[PDB]
Design a protein around this nucleic acid. Structure first.
Ligand code: ADP
Lengths: 443, 88, 85, 77, 89, 94, 88, 93, 92
DNA sequence: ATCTGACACGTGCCTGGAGACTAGGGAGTAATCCCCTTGGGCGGTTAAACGCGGGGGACAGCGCGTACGTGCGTTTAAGCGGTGCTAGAGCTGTCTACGACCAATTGAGCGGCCTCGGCACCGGG
DNA sequence: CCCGGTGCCGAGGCCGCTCAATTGGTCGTAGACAGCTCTAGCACCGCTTAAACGCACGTACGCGCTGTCCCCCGCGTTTAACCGCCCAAGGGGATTACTCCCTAGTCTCCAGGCACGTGTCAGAT
């Protein structure tokens, strides 16, 4: 905890000069103690002041539990929900009188945004602390407008990934942290005073290393036929010739990129959407009709040769559905958690997948879902059936299985197709990793 | 003039007169002639057919009325016409 | 008698009564006025047509209430959902 | 001069529409609805006429009025 | 007026029928009325689009916006064919 | 309560309000579906769908008042399909 | 479980007009009791109205060479049908 | 010219519109004046009725709900807006 | 950029009801009601011109168009307001 | 078998066709930039679906009495034909007093910027 | 159902500036109007006969009353989907302002069709 003691040395410093900071310690250090350690350090002079801490929901439980455990006692209260929040508003303590019992105010981004009026009345807030800075990476987001109505005499931003998309997210934040605010060195002059990013370097060799390897596939004939009919037109006719169950259908106004990405994923998506096709491709071999599908199949047969459990990711949910159909026909037992499935339902599925005796080895899993803090370690191999257009999602998904408790070495199979937009996207996500990799150079 | 029976020239003149607009294109007279011709043909057909039922060798106001009344399209364009010397 | 007048195309009101009414109701708009012998004919044709439609919708309105005798309520329900007044 | 629209005539018209049996209070109502119609059309006609500096309701005046009210009248001019 | 043409259209569709005198009147009236509707519509369409020319395009929209139903879907074809023949020749 | 007294409550509140019924999203789906038939790839501004919805509601309210008149004419209080079918026949609608 | 032949179909967009919403539109019209075959009847009459208006709007649009149906295209269609809307 | 007559509406602006609306070849001098004087009358009536409506609902400003009501109430102004559907205007009890 | 009668519709209101506010989306109906009544009258008076085969829309025509659009007693009191004004404009 | 229509035809004068200008709106292009799809994330929360009585209203049957249709003999008065008379529709020719047009002139009303009072949403009553 | 008290945000406010409404001569043309011809609308008579009218008489329909049973409404509970806010990147699509060329109105001559005047003929009246 020497680093975290340098983490509290630098936020006591920030408190001194008056400036405003964005602690950017990597994810895995804990991301929880550091924050409450600073809140508890303010006991010197008086912890009894206005204090606010906005965060998602799960962050809130952990925060409160830790305030209870690492430190003996800190008036804390979770202001979650609506109408039931009105009673605890006053049961807590006096309106504005800040006694040594004025309980820490912990809210969510919705609550903060929807009813800022209530908290607008409170005194200049000693320190508003926003857990996930990425939420404010847009300078026109309605939360930002409502967040300025608060009278704040100090600000603070916690994050682990300051920039993901481009530099303008750095620009919008910098207005937030500091309203006043070859060339690479010149940037490092502005940013050295505030940013404090301690990598996972002081602690290293924590877990067995991983391999991320790209294995291309060759677009088959039928997909080429579909693609040319899309580069020009008539893909709304070569599939509309039958003209049943749906006539005079809409045009694929779909941005070429994503209508041709959907092809490069699996042509069935277009065919289903186009014709009536009340039934799935029962060929169960036409599913073979996709090259990327066939490379998945063979990979999986070679990875059952050892049985180590796999992980599958995708961008949409129609495609995971096709996959499930395919495998369920052969007979494999699958578990799946997308955004459509409910919360408590998905938590027990894991508790079962985590059951080592049970042989539900396959695990379908959408990309953006899962919130944060799930514990999936019974599997060992992750297959990114699609790309992102934002590599920080890929890193998160890989890390979800690359977390503590993975004795077996992990592989990653980013499938893709040559001579298509999938290869274009890989180059884009690569240049975004490079945009953040040269930034990691500064440290 | 070149393609039909109706007087493309006269139709054009009538458009020039009546000051419907400043300029009239060249195709504008030609198109209208054709549409009017089609419309007349349809009506004259049903009426004669109406007269072919009544077997009358001569089309009379009654037949026109009957035809307009029966057909589902003309009954809609011709919503409330009251043909002179006709009947239901 | 339903069948007879459904095949004929003759006039059903007499001539001069229709003329006088039309002259009087004009009087209350402009004193002294003349009328071509074709105008009074147009006015009769139109009126006769109008009344036949009203009657055909009133019959519909009565079949609704399970009668076959027409009554003044019917004309009124017809003219109200027509929008006349 | 509205009592000249006599009881037999209303009855004849009514059998053109489809009516089968006539009540007895139907006649006064008919005589009123005719009068309203005739009073509207004639007013519009006299307007059109005067606008042309005449003293003779004439060809195309009545037709124009009847058109004005949703009742195109082909022929009669 | 349109007598000759309406007499000509009849001889073509029903080669052996005639037509009385009151019928011809009704027919001429019908033609004139359609003409007027169509032209008025076209003029209004022009004005709403700040254009001083009544081109063919406006004759077609007008036919679509006033001729009811399939009756129009044909008239449009009939007019396009005749403007094409005239232009090419 | 007794059935019919809360119903007269509703024919008063809604006749006094001017807030629109029909959820905004379903109507906008319907209009689009009805449109793909005419012109493939036609896009609607938002104001357009708004106007269309306003007009439709008015149409339906009018039809509903005349279909109540027709029902009362037959000595009932329940409005049944025949009434609508009678009302439209007298108004000319297709 | 992977659905068999059945894919992932969706509900029709007309069924989107919920029975509760027809009842609310009726009570504002003054109705007391409503039958049950009424609902499947209102839907058809809504569909017909809408189909006549949208057809005119899509026409008025194309003539402007455009591909978006504005609100002034809708206002003109209604005016051609007798209903005039003030306020847009 | 608006001044020479007692009208409050703009005579010149109406004249210009009439001349630039392709309504005819030559507009006269009196036609702009007459039109202005009729339009003014019509507006005054509607507004006067709508205003009587508001005070009742105990408000000192007019809203579309008031104009609708006024129009529906009076007979002539109804025969005139026989089909008009004012936006956000509700219906009459 | 967008001509409207808003300025004049608030002068007449003041004259009729001295102390009453107007609100917004409320003169968005009053302006429309005027524009529409203008259109109808003018179009009628053009048709009334093209019919009578004259190339001039004069006062007589505007009057016969009023008498046919504005329904009922409105006409009378409009016609008067209007004629009054033409005589007045004349003796200027 | 014939008479109310229906079918040739004529002259001519009046209007469609052709050939050409100077004009001049429309087809073509470039641009900027801003609202509009398509597929997914999570969190709200209010409306919609469902099930179950229970009571009211739709519907069918029956009976009385009264008002509608039919029939037959008077009595209107419409229709027709013919005669007379003049208002006023329709058209022509003169001559201006009225509208278009252009140019010089400039104050009225229009986009964007102030502020504070009336009027919607509540809890309390 | 009243009642404060609440904010608290749109209804009034002001203000230079641009362009659009006045005001003055020609400017020509569109208007009134005076006068004449002759069509057709109105008034009135006499006669025939068809449609209207009045009264009697029988009975079919309209309306009240009763009983059975179907199905709509109100309430409570569980479901669900509209609604908000966010991705990323596309990439389009409208509006405005850019520019040249091939057709509108314009003449001008000159062709030969359709309109009002006449002879036939044939149907169905
Ligand atoms: N590299 C490290 N060295 C020492 N302690 C560490 C390290 N990483 C994490 N920790 C431990 O993390 C704890 C704080 O995190 P905690 O909230 O307990 O769990 P989590 O890491 O899951 O957020 C400290 O008690 C600290 O000892």
């Amino acid at each position: 905890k020497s680093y975290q003691l340098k983490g509290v040395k630098w936020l006591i410093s920030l408190w001194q000069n008056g400036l405003n900071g964005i602690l950017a310690d990597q994810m895995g250090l804990g991301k929880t103690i550091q924050t409450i350690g600073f809140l508890s350090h303010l006991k010197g002079n008086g912890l009894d002041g206005p204090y606010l801490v906005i965060a998602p929901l799960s962050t809130l439980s952990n925060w409160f539990n830790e305030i209870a455990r690492f430190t003996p006692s800190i008036n804390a209260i979770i202001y979650h929900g609506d109408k039931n929040q009105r009673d605890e508003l006053r049961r807590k303590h006096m309106p504005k009188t800040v006694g040594p019992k004025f309980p820490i105010v912990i809210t969510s981004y919705e609550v903060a945004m929807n009813d800022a009026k209530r908290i607008l009345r409170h005194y200049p807030w000693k320190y508003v602390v926003i857990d996930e800075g990425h939420r404010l990476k847009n300078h026109k987001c309605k939360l930002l407008r409502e967040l300025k109505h608060l009278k704040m005499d100090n600000k603070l931003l916690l994050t682990g990934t300051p920039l993901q998309n481009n530099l303008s997210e750095l620009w919008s934040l910098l207005n937030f942290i500091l309203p006043d605010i070859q060339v690479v060195s010149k940037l490092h002059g502005i940013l050295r005073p505030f940013i404090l990013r301690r990598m996972k370097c002081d602690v290293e060799l924590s877990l067995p290393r991983k391999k991320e390897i790209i294995m291309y596939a060759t677009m088959t004939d039928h997909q080429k036929k579909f693609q040319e009919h899309l580069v020009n037109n008539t893909l709304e006719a070569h599939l509309g010739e039958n003209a049943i169950r749906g006539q005079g259908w809409k045009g694929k106004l779909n941005n070429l990129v994503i209508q041709l990405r959907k092809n490069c994923n699996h042509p069935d998506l277009l065919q289903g959407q186009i014709d009536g096709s009340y039934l799935y491709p029962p060929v169960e071999e036409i599913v073979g009709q996709c090259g990327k599908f066939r490379l998945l199949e063979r990979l999986l047969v070679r990875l059952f040769a050892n049985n180590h459990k796999v992980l599958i990711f995708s961008q949409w949910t129609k495609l995971l559905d096709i996959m499930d159909y395919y495998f369920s026909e052969k007979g494999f037992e699958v578990c799946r958690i997308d955004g459509s499935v409910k919360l408590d339902e998905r938590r027990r599925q894991i508790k079962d997948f985590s059951d080592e005796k049970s042989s539900c080895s396959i695990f379908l899993l959408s990309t953006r879902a899962g919130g944060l803090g799930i514990n999936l370690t019974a599997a060992d191999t992750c297959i990114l059936y699609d790309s992102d257009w934002n590599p920080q999602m890929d890193l998160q998904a890989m890390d979800r299985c690359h977390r503590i408790g993975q004795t077996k070495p992990v592989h990653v199979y980013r499938l893709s197709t040559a001579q298509s937009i999938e290869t274009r996207v890989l180059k884009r996500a690569y240049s975004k990793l490079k945009l953040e990799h040269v930034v990691i150079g500064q440290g | 003039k070149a393609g039909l029976q109706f007087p493309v020239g006269r139709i054009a003149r009538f458009l020039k007169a009546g000051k419907y607009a400043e300029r009239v294109g060249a195709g504008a007279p030609v198109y209208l002639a054709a549409v009017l011709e089609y419309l007349a043909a349809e009506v004259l057909e049903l009426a004669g057919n109406a007269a072919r039922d009544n077997k009358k060798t001569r089309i009379v106001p009654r037949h026109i009325q009957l035809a307009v009344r029966n057909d589902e399209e003309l009954s809609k364009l011709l919503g409330d016409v009251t043909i002179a010397n006709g009947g239901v | 008698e339903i069948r007879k007048y459904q095949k004929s195309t003759e006039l059903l009101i007499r001539k001069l009564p229709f003329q006088r009414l039309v002259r009087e109701i004009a009087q209350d708009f402009k004193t002294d006025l003349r009328f071509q012998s074709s105008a009074v004919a147009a006015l009769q044709e139109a009126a006769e047509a109008y009344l036949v439609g009203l009657f055909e919708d009133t019959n519909l309105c009565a079949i609704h209430a399970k009668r076959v005798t027409i009554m003044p309520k019917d004309i009124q329900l017809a003219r109200r959902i027509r929008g006349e007044r | 001069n509205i009592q000249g629209i006599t009881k037999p005539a209303i009855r004849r018209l009514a059998r053109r529409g489809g009516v089968k049996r006539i009540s007895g209070l139907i006649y006064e109502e008919t005589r009123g609805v005719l009068k309203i119609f005739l009073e509207n059309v004639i007013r519009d006609a006299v307007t059109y006429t005067e606008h042309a500096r005449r003293k003779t309701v004439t060809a195309m005046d009545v037709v124009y009025a009847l058109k004005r009210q949703g009742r195109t009248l082909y022929g009669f001019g | 007026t349109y007598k000759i043409y309406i007499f000509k259209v009849l001889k073509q569709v029903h080669p052996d029928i005639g037509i009385s005198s009151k019928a011809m009147g009704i027919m001429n009236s019908f033609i004139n009325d359609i003409f007027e509707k169509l032209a008025s519509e076209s003029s209004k369409l022009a004005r709403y689009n700040k254009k001083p020319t009544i081109t063919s395009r406006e004759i077609q929209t007008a036919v679509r916006l006033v001729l009811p139903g399939e009756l129009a879907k044909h008239a449009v074809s009939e007019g396009t064919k005749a403007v094409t023949k005239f232009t090419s020749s």
